[PDB]
Amino acid sequence: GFKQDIATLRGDLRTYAQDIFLAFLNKYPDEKRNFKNYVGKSDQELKSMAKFGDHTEKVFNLMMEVADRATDCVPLASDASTLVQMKQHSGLTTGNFEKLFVALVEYMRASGQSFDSQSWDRFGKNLVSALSSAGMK
Ligand code: FDE
Ligand SMILES: O=[N+]([O-])c1ccc(O)cc1
């Protein structure tokens, strides 16, 4: 289930973080707008960019803690509050989270592994909704 999925992603987090984030950028190429230095690079080059590898693991480090503190795929309102505030997110929509979660779900569904894809769908939908209540456009 969802709890074992957090343990699975954490056991190889930098490769899952990178492969899921690349799935996202490849599904939603216009999403590179928010990351201008990622444009004009393949997946093998992005992996070679220090901040790509660092930022994508740190995103995933956070997402996995929020997942871990969730109950029944419902994040802590305190965790949506932290996210909306961030600093980087000054410019960021719930749309961009929904997109990342559509990418994450398809990646899970397409893998040979027993990921609880429906739970991740639920989680993203619920994180979006909590970000929308904590004051994200
Ligand atoms: C679209 C999108 C989505 C997202 C999501 C997310 C989640 C879930 C979580 C997160 C977190 C974060 N962010 Fe985040 N995000 C985004 C975006 C971004 C950007 C653009 C930035 C800046 C950096 C770079 O990469 O360049 C960030 C960013 C970020 C960070 C750090 C890095 C810096 O800036 O310094 C962190 C930790 N973000 N995030
Ligand atoms: O997954 N994410 O939201 C990310 C991943 C990498 C990055 O540089 C910024 C945001």
TrEMBL record:
Keyword line: Heme, Iron, Metal-binding, Oxidoreductase, Oxygen transport, Peroxidase, Transport
Positions annotated to bind heme b 8: H55, H89
Residue positions binding heme b 7: H55, K58, Q88, H89
Binding positions for heme b 11 per the UniProt entry: Q88, H89, F97
Binding, heme b 4: K36, H55, H89
Residues engaged in binding heme b 6: K51, H55, H89
Protein name (database record): Dehaloperoxidase B
InterPro entries: Globin, Globin-like_sf, Globin/Proto, Mb-like_M
Stretches assigned to the Globin domain: 1-136
Binding site residues for heme b 2: H89
Binding, heme b 5: N37, H89
Pfam families, alphabetized: Globin
Segments forming a coiled coil: none
Binding site for heme b 9: H55, H89
UniProt-annotated binding residues for heme b 10: K58, H89
Domain of life: Eukaryota
Amino-acid positions noted as binding heme b 12 in the UniProt annotation, renumbered to this chain: H89
List of residues binding heme b 3: H55, H89
PROSITE patterns per the UniProt record, alphabetical: GLOBIN
